[PDB]
Structure formats: C-alpha cells, structure tokens
C-alpha cells in the first residue's frame, strides 16, 4: 500500500 502505512506497521512491530 502506501509507504506511510508500511512504516507505521513496522514501527508497531518493533
């Protein structure tokens, strides 16, 4: 999807 969405998901995953 949007790079922004991917980044947010990765951040949450830690």
**Three-state DSSP state, 1:** coil
Question: If phi over 0 gives left and psi between -120 and 50 gives alpha, with beta otherwise, what is residue 2?
Answer: beta
Say how far apart CA 8 and CA 2 lie, in whole Å: 10
In the block, residue with structure tokens 């949007």: 2
Method in brief:
NMR
Say how far apart CA 10 and CA 14 lie, in whole Å: 6
Question: How many other β-carbons are positioned within 10 Å of the β-carbon of residue 11?
Answer: 8
Q: Is the dihedral of CA 5, 8, 3, 1 positive or negative?
A: negative
| Burial (CB count within 10 angstroms: exposed 0-12, middle 13-18, buried 19+), residue 12 | exposed
In the block, residue with structure tokens 């969405």: 5
Residue count of the chain, please give it. Answer: 14
| C-alpha torsion 3→7→9→14, nearest 10 | 160
Say how far apart CA 2 and CA 14 lie, in whole Å: 19
């Amino acid at each position: 999807g949007i790079l922004d969405a991917i980044k947010a998901i990765a951040k949450a995953a830690g």
